[PDB]
Swiss-Prot record, chain A:
Shown residues within the full chain: 27 to 160 of 956
Lineage: Eukaryota, Fungi, Dikarya, Ascomycota, Saccharomycotina
Highest taxon in the source lineage: Eukaryota
Coiled coil ranges: none
Organism of this sequence: Saccharomyces cerevisiae (strain ATCC 204508 / S288c)
Localization per record: Nucleus; Chromosome, Centromere; Cytoplasm, Cytoskeleton, Microtubule organizing center, Spindle pole body
Protein name: Centromere DNA-binding protein complex CBF3 subunit A
Further comment: Present with 1350 molecules/cell in log phase SD medium.
Ranges annotated as spanning the membrane: none
Reported function: Acts as a component of the centromere DNA-binding protein complex CBF3, which is essential for chromosome segregation and movement of centromeres along microtubules. CBF3 is required for the recruitment of other kinetochore complexes to CEN DNA. It plays a role in the attachment of chromosomes to the spindle and binds selectively to a highly conserved DNA sequence called CDEIII, found in centromers and in several promoters.
Assembly and interaction partners: Component of the CBF3 copmplex, which is formed of CBF3A/CBF2, CBF3B/CEP3, CBF3C/CTF13 and CBF3D. CBF2 strongly interacts with BIR1. Interacts with the central kinetochore protein CTF19.
UniProtKB/Swiss-Prot annotation, chain B:
Any Gene Ontology CC annotation: kinetochore
Lineage: Eukaryota, Fungi, Dikarya, Ascomycota, Saccharomycotina
Gene Ontology MF: a single term: DNA binding, bending
Name this polypeptide is given: Centromere DNA-binding protein complex CBF3 subunit C
Gene assigned in the entry: CTF13
Matching InterPro entries: LRR_dom_sf (IPR032675)
Swiss-Prot record, chain C:
Residue(s) carrying Phosphothreonine: T136
Gene (name only): SKP1
Compartment list: Cytoplasm; Nucleus; Chromosome, Centromere, Kinetochore
Short name of one Pfam family: Skp1
Designated name of the protein: Suppressor of kinetochore protein 1
Any one GO cellular component localisation term in the record: SCF ubiquitin ligase complex
Main location: cytoplasm
Organism: Saccharomyces cerevisiae (strain ATCC 204508 / S288c) (Baker's yeast)
TM regions (residue ranges): none
Curated annotation (Swiss-Prot), chain E:
Subcellular location: Nucleus; Chromosome, Centromere
Quaternary structure and partners: Component of the CBF3 copmplex, which is formed of CBF3A/CBF2, CBF3B/CEP3, CBF3C/CTF13 and CBF3D.
Highest taxon above the source species: Eukaryota
Protein name per the record: Centromere DNA-binding protein complex CBF3 subunit B
Other observations noted: Present with 1900 molecules/cell in log phase SD medium.
Disulphide-bridged cysteine pairs: none
Length: 128, 421, 151, 579, 64, 161, 68
């Protein structure tokens, strides 16, 4: 009751659907290393950590070893398109997981405490 | 099952309110309003002709449906409604009665660019599309079905524009395709993004077309930082950029403000310009003081909602001059609390509905005291308090304005104690 | 504190005056036992109206100019089930709430009508496509060729 | 009158209309495709309409009934005092024998027994106009000292004519029994030489009312108000505008209203709010002048028409206003309930249909008046309380009923005909409950006159074409209450009775002549005669014939449905009720 | 009040009129031009009601 | 005149307040040194003369001729000399005192009656017939309109003669 | 006869003070409000050289003399 309005009033709906896309991909990623097991999961039990977030960003965003989608990383501008998209969606995923964190703050999760300045440093590193 | 034309039997006053009460979720393939999802303990954890639909139809629509990639059930359900629902007669009757009532129904049509064509679009409040019609198509069957004599219906002039719906290069091509026809007098308003003093090229492209519309009202912005740059005047009009075209500033009727923190984070919410507005509306600014504004010339309606903080016009200080009494007398001794018969007509149960004394004040220094309250307004009438929070003073509404419910408080639980003067 | 409803069927329904306040036509007629004509609405539809007034006569009701408490007003699930009725007779319920100016019942039925209209299958929308005039058949052929690869 | 205008106008044109290369008359099927004999060829697209027996002439007919009931039931019956300048013999002074007979006939008990009767009876009208009655009792007391003086002060002459207007209003609501008991029936008919068998309801009560108006005039002509403008002129003109005089005389009252508006705008005073540095005298002056000016706007509106060249109301009650809503809703309630109807009437003469959003916003604020009149106090015995209560109750019901009339005519929303039937009977039942003592002069304000003017117009007019059961049941009470209107209206009452008769014979005219199909152009004498008579009254309103006499002694030069048309033109002629 | 009660709109003659009327449009436009002169040259607060509403020598008077 | 810092730091001829290139450089109250104590230079010549316009309408046009004062509680009505101001001066004015006046406007005032009524000889129809109409006592409303029409020109022909 | 005064910029003079009351008092004669309160009837309508030569020239050259 306390936060749910300004939880919703935090965002434009467009951003909320972006995040409902993004951290759902995060949760599916945790289940692909079965980090949370199994067709629904509570808001109270969810694993959130800085290295979990960052390792999601690794295994999905940057780690394009991935021999089905290996080979788009050479061009001065098309890969500059690729990683501009990556740094924008990096910030978007950061906002998604920040918002998911703040969701589970009121939704009773001991496993939702983030140290966002690590993620700042990650952002600043990719920025550099 | 459902009989459509049986619903088309019973007349237009009925048929209006149904579209007024099926807002945007005309389809079944619509997502949830996300507070049910919030107020829960469950997260959604999710075929081949629909894979062919993703194969073919969807790469047109990975500009908008890509926001909805959670729950691919809704995705594979979506494109089937994207065939036949968006030509159904109920939808066309909806646009008939809507352009009859000019946005009094569900509203805000929007110039998109899909089918690589620059047609129009309808979004819901979840910004989900349903219908993509071009202006030829829209003028063809639904405008001209009811374009008998009223030439303002031969006009179509109530359509938002929404940069930040789409890419800045699509803003560029969007105004290019706007240029090739007389669609300047077709749009209704323009929206803004930023999602220091450096206006974005989307907004620059917007401003450099903005005056040529000549049929423009209803402008809304969405960023407080953007608000600072474009209409929070700050004493700046002699600028190459950053100016928002005095001629089309005259042409508008009304200004909407989506979501901010403060208006006078600067010295003032200033509108030295912007003469001919009649209605400002505050949607999700965090903090307001009332007197943070320049209070432009005559903006009669001023509605607001979703506030964190209201100060007041702090008329309470000024009422301590005209009858010159004590604050504790002003609550205890100087409230008669007459609520004669019209007060109980509406509900307004949570706010304490007070009234000053017809005995202790005696028809002089009362109408004087009422005109003190009038002095805080400068010629406005409609107030309309929705979801609100945290005034810092007493609620003070003059009885002339309070009668006929020109003020209409909708939600009141973070607040009470209206002394109606 | 009691008025009489004399319908087109003329079935005299002596209801409470607090029932009569919801019908703003009849609440205006209170300024005019206490009979009035309803020459179109049948008295079973009127009895549905009266039973709704029995249920939500004591209920609290919005400003009727809203969005939140007007358009996103939640239904009564009791009056969902209470109005899980004929499609046809539901329209007579609508016309009754119109004719007697019973606005929250009008909106409550209206939203259930909005429920029943939305969510219908694109199968039947493809089928019940040009029942009414709605299009030139050239455009009908163009639409069917527009999705030709799957339809 | 006549077009096609049938039921269920379709969506898309057929092939025949594309061949036709004209406007798409998108009816069932077309008036143009039926004119080419290809009726079924435009039918054959999809969902072939319905029965071809829905009376398709009727929407066109009601569109022209708007033309009528604007230009006849306000303009044609009331607002054409078509008189002459040559055929009217001159009257140079002619009230030194006439108005001085009212100087003679007025008695002090005959003054004060009107005055004290009208105290609690009419204690909102002058209270809306001037306020206190005891200062006016003081003016009647000093008036017998201000009676036949020599130092006629201009101000005191306004005070003298003020109580003649007050006596006018006291005649306008006193019943005839107390009128014959307080006054005397006979010396009027002695002085006129007319009949002794003329108890005042038989014609001369309203004549004596107009004589008190005329003796207000005879002193106001001595006030030199064109060189001496003041507010009491406008106040007494409000009081005179309460009478039937604006309807019995539109043109003179137009010029007097013109001088009153010029008088007001001489002051150049607009706002009515006592600010910080204001005189309390000026404060109360503005508070009074508020209700004064809004009653002035109400007087501006009721005489408005083609004989009304100078307008006053420049504000809108919804959606370039002047002082709108900065005003306490006490008797501007009486204005705002009129300005509600005012904005309806910029769509009566013009067939452009207003947006229905606006009309439903009007439907929203309708109940605001309905339950702000309930937000007043209540006094059973103070007759001004229930008087003002029934006035505002009548006004909101009147605008309500006319609004549902507009709903049926312009768009035909759901059950709006039955809404017309319902509110008609509710208003007529309110008249029936005020067929009593203490409440017969709840039935004397011209609002009931102009309301029944619309009711007996349209209920008879819909009885013409639809012989309906409820319209017949209402038509019975129409014919009963048309005879049972009060005698305070007089000549326009008998004109209304002839109008009821002519509309009944117009129903018989529809009964005797079948409507001729000519493709989709229909023909009846009901069409053409009503086409003609409105234009006749407009040519009377074309006041060149009153200016052809002004530019010298100049003299200008300007079938089946030609016969019975021109038989009913003089059979039940409109010329009975022009004047 | 009087002159506008006669519904004087045009000040140039028209072909489908009464010649009394179409000539009276100029023969009262001269009245209109002197009426505009009295409307203008009496420019005062005591004169609130205005009439601006916008041969070869009488229109030329109201021109200057 | 250019202000102080316009004459001191030598900037553009800038009557802004205080300047458009001196307030920005930190001299707001330093550049307001532009225009009880006394002064007698021509600084009033911009500062005053527009107040003259307030004089020019309200005192010359309104105050000297149009501003009119009355006395409501003392002035007699028109019941005193009801017809006698009209009748005595209608009985004095004879046919010489009508047409000899009218021949001033016939010779001297051609634009006036063309600006109002067209011809003065067309009016001479009524003024000649007025001596068959002064003797009339039961007129019509039209004939009295002609009476008050020609007595207005009888009024006008007094003054300019 | 009078040296022109000011506060530094805003010029003050007996001519200046009298040119005020030329317009003020004559427009106060053009104020018909208290004539309307006369129309209200019983409601009563109530309403250096720079200091003294103003009183001289206003009383002697009486500006209300143009109301006859
Ligand atoms: Zn056709
Ligand atoms: Zn056809
Ligand atoms: Zn300078």
């Amino acid at each position: 009751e306390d936060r749910f309005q300004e939880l919703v009033d935090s965002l434009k709906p467009r951003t909320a659907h972006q995040y409902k896309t993004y951290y759902t991909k995060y949760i599916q990623w945790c289940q692909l290393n079965q980090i949370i097991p199994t067709n629904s999961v509570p808001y109270k039990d969810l694993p959130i950590s800085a290295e979990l977030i960052h390792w999601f960003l690794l295994d999905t965003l940057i780690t394009d070893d991935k021999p089905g989608e290996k080979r788009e990383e050479t061009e001065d501008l098309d890969e500059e398109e690729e990683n501009s998209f990556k740094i924008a969606t990096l910030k978007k995923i950061i906002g998604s997981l920040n918002f998911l964190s703040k969701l589970c703050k009121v939704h009773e999760n001991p496993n939702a405490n983030i140290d966002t300045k690590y993620l700042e440093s990650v952002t600043k590193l990719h920025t550099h | 099952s459902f009989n459509p034309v049986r619903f088309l039997e019973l007349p237009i006053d009925i048929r209006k309110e149904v579209y007024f009460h099926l807002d945007g979720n005309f389809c079944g393939a619509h997502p949830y309003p996300i507070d049910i999802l919030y107020k829960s303990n469950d997260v959604e954890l999710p075929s081949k002709r629909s894979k062919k639909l993703l194969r073919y139809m969807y790469p047109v629509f990975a500009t908008y449906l890509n926001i909805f990639e959670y729950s691919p059930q809704l995705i594979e359900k979506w494109l089937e409604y994207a065939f036949w629902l968006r030509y159904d007669c109920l939808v066309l009757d909806c646009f008939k009665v809507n352009h009859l009532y000019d946005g009094t129904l569900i509203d805000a049509l929007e110039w998109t660019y899909l089918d690589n064509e620059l047609r129009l679009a309808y979004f819901n409040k979840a910004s989900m599309l349903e219908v993509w019609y071009t202006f030829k198509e829209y003028k063809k069957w639904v405008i001209d079905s009811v374009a008998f004599d009223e030439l303002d219906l031969l006009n179509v002039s109530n359509i938002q524009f929404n940069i930040d719906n789409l890419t800045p290069q699509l803003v560029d091509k969007c105004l290019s395709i706007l240029e090739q026809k007389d669609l300047f007098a077709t749009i209704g308003e323009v929206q803004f993004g930023q999602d220091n003093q450096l206006t974005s090229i989307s907004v620059i492209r917007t401003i450099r077309s903005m005056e040529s519309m000549k049929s423009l009202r209803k402008i809304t912005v969405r960023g407080e930082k953007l608000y600072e740059l474009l209409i929070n005047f700050h004493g700046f009009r002699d600028n190459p950029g950053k100016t928002i075209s005095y001629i089309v500033k005259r042409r508008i009727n009304e200004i909407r403000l989506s979501r901010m923190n403060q208006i006078s984070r600067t010295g003032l919410a200033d509108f030295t310009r912007w003469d001919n507005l009649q209605k400002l509306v505050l949607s999700r600014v965090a903090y307001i003081d009332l007197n943070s504004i320049v209070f432009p010339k005559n903006f009669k309606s001023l509605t607001m909602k979703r506030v964190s903080k209201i100060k007041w016009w702090n008329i309470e200080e000024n009422i301590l001059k005209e009858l010159k009494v004590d604050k504790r007398t002003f609550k205890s001794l100087y409230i008669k609390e007459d609520d004669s018969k019209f007060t109980k007509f509406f509900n307004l149960r949570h706010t304490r509905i007070k009234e000053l004394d017809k005995s202790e004040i005696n028809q002089i220094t009362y109408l004087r005291c009422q005109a003190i309250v009038w002095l805080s307004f400068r010629t406005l009438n409609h107030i309309k308090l929705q979801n609100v929070s945290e005034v810092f003073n007493n609620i003070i509404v003059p009885r002339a304005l309070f009668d006929s419910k020109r003020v209409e408080i909708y939600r009141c639980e973070k607040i009470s104690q209206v002394l109606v003067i | 504190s009691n008025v009489v409803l004399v319908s087109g069927e003329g079935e005299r329904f002596t209801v409470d005056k607090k029932i009569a306040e919801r019908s703003l036509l009849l609440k205006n007629y209170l300024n005019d036992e206490i009979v009035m004509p309803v020459p179109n609405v049948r008295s079973s539809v009127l009895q549905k109206v009266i039973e709704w007034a029995e249920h939500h006569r004591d209920s609290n009701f919005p400003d009727e100019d809203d969005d939140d408490s007007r358009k996103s007003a939640p239904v009564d699930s009791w009056d969902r089930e209470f109005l899980k009725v004929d499609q046809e007779m539901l329209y007579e319920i609508i016309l009754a709430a119109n004719y007697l100016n019973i606005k929250p019942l009008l909106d409550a039925g209206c939203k259930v009508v909005a429920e029943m209209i939305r969510g219908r299958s694109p199968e039947e929308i493809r089928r019940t496509f040009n029942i009414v005039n709605d299009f030139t058949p050239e455009e009908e052929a163009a639409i069917r060729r527009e999705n030709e690869w799957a339809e | 009158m006549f077009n096609r205008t049938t039921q269920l106008k379709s969506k898309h044109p057929c092939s025949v209309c594309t061949r036709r290369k004209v406007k798409c008359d998108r009816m069932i099927p077309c008036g143009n495709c039926r004119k080419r004999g290809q009726d079924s060829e435009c039918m054959k697209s999809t969902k072939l309409i319905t029965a071809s027996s829905s009376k398709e002439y009727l929407p066109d007919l009601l569109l022209f009934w708007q033309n009528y009931e604007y230009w006849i039931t306000n303009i044609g019956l009331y607002k054409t005092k078509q008189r002459d300048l040559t055929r009217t013999p001159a009257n140079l002074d002619t009230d030194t024998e006439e108005c001085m007979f009212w100087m003679n006939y007025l008695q002090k008990d005959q003054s004060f027994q009107l005055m004290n009767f009208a105290m609690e009876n009419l204690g909102a009208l002058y209270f809306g106009s001037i306020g206190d009655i005891s200062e006016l009792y003081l003016r009647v007391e000093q008036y017998w000292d201000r009676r036949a003086d020599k130092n006629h002060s201009v101000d005191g002459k306004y005070w003298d004519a003020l109580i003649w207007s007050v006596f006018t209003m006291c005649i306008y609501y006193m019943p005839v029994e107390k009128l014959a008991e307080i006054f005397s029936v006979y010396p009027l008919h002695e002085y006129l030489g007319s009949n002794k068998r003329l108890n005042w309801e038989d014609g001369m009560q309203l004549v004596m009312c107009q004589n008190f108006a005329r003796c207000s005039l005879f002193q106001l002509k001595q006030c030199d108000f064109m060189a001496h403008p003041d507010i009491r002129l406008v106040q007494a003109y409000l009081i005179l505008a309460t009478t039937t005089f604006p309807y019995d005389e539109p043109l003179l009252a137009n010029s007097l209203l013109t001088q009153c508006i010029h008088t007001f705008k001489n002051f150049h005073v607009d706002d009515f709010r006592p600010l910080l540095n204001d005189d309390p005298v000026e404060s109360i002056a503005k508070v009074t002048l508020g209700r004064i000016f809004y009653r002035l706007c109400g007087c501006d509106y009721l005489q408005s028409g083609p004989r009304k060249p100078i307008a006053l109301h420049t504000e809108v009650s919804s959606l370039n206003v002047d002082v709108y809503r900065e005003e306490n809703s006490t008797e501007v309630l009486y204005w705002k309930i009129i300005s509600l109807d005012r904005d309806l009437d910029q769509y009566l003469n013009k067939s452009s249909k207003p947006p229905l959003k606006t009309l439903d916003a009007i439907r929203r604020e309708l109940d605001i008046f309905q339950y702000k009149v309930d937000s007043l106090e209540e006094d059973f015995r103070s007759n001004n309380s229930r008087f003002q209560k029934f006035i505002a109750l009548f006004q909101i019901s009147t605008v309500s009923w006319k609004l549902f009339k507009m709903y049926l005519i312009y768009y035909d929303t759901a059950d709006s005909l039955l809404k017309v039937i319902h509110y008609s009977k509710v208003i007529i039942s309110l008249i029936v409950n005020n067929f009593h003592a203490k409440s017969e002069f709840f039935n004397r304000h011209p609002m009931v006159m102009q309301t029944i003017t619309r009711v007996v117009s349209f209920i008879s007019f819909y009885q013409i074409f639809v012989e309906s059961a409820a319209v017949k049941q209402l038509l019975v009470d129409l014919t009963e209450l048309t005879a049972n209107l009060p005698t305070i209206f007089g000549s326009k009452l008998d004109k209304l009775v002839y109008l009821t008769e002519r509309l009944s014979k117009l129903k018989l005219l529809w009964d005797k002549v079948q409507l001729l199909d000519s493709g989709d152009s229909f023909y009846h004498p009901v069409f053409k005669i009503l086409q003609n008579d409105i234009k006749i009254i407009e040519l009377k309103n074309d006041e060149m014939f009153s200016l052809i006499k002004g530019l010298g002694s100049l003299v200008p030069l300007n079938s089946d449905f030609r016969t019975i048309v021109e038989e009913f033109q003089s059979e039940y002629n409109i010329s009975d009720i022009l004047s």
